[PDB]
């Protein structure tokens, strides 16, 4: 059930043409898309494509994104890959290889809710 | 648009 505007916004046919074109170029990081969950209470964020190396940990670029959205330590904060919560120690590219779409880009939603979309 | 990758730093 995960719903990203990215998706609307951009065909698949040019996604999954960036996408080749991007994993071609860089064989050691991964494209990742990054939205806000629907509905959730969080930030959104100005950039939505990460170019990300497949060794960072998903613990690593939690961090990323709960600096980039200014949350406070003690403030929850939630990644859902195919509705599911991805464990920390996984790295970006486990993630991307069991997860990744047709298009080649694997999409992230970040919400301060523990259920996601609502 | 069609926005740049962020790099995102080991
Ligand atoms: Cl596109
Ligand atoms: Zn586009
Ligand atoms: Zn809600």
């Known amino acids: ?118 | 648009e069609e926005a740049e990758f962020v790099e995102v730093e080991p």
């Open chain 1, 1 to 118: 059930s995960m719903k990203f505007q990215y998706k609307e916004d951009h065909p698949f046919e040019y996604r999954k043409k960036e996408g080749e074109k991007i994993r071609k170029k860089y064989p050691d990081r991964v494209p990742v898309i990054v939205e806000k969950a629907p509905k959730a209470r969080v930030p959104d964020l100005d950039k939505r494509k990460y170019l990300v190396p497949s060794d960072l940990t998903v613990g690593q670029f939690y961090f990323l994104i709960r600096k980039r959205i200014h949350l406070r330590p003690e403030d929850a904060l939630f990644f859902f890959v195919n509705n599911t919560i991805p464990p920390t120690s996984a790295t970006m590219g486990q993630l991307y290889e069991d997860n990744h779409e047709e298009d080649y880009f694997l999409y992230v939603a970040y919400s301060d809710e523990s259920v996601y979309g609502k």
